[PDB]
Symmetry: C2
Amino acid sequence: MFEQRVNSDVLTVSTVQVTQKPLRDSVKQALKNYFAQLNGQDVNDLYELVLAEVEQPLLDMVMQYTLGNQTRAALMMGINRGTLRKKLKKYGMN
Amino acid sequence: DVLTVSTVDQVTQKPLRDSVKQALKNYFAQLNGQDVNDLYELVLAEVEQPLLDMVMQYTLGNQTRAALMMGINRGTLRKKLKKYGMN
């Protein structure tokens, strides 16, 4: 009945003829390899595991982009400074 | 380094964070001063979807085992699945 509002910009990486492929596929491949090594081992924190692998490079890139300005970083990210501060502290980036 | 992707004519493993960084580098380069207010959401959708897809395949669609493996409650799991039209 109704369409949605979302950011439709793309995130891609290079693959090799060289072409781009969606970032989501890298996450997918990394998980396949992860399960392959796990071989039925117990895991109970996969969300946290993946999130840490993704948030760190994101925080660094946005901070680098805003030259360290946290106010503009929170704005660009669509998160309040409180949540931003919390994520940085979480990864020792304070 | 439990999360890695294959890279190449020999193939070697590189951390997933390196893929995320490369993609953001491409993203920021084309931003061209344009403004953005939801970059976290854009990245989240890009990584949550494949994570959900893979965990659900690996647990045969069993929500209770999927949520335990992820370390989130089922209500949360369900909300994310519905958000991405995967329910």
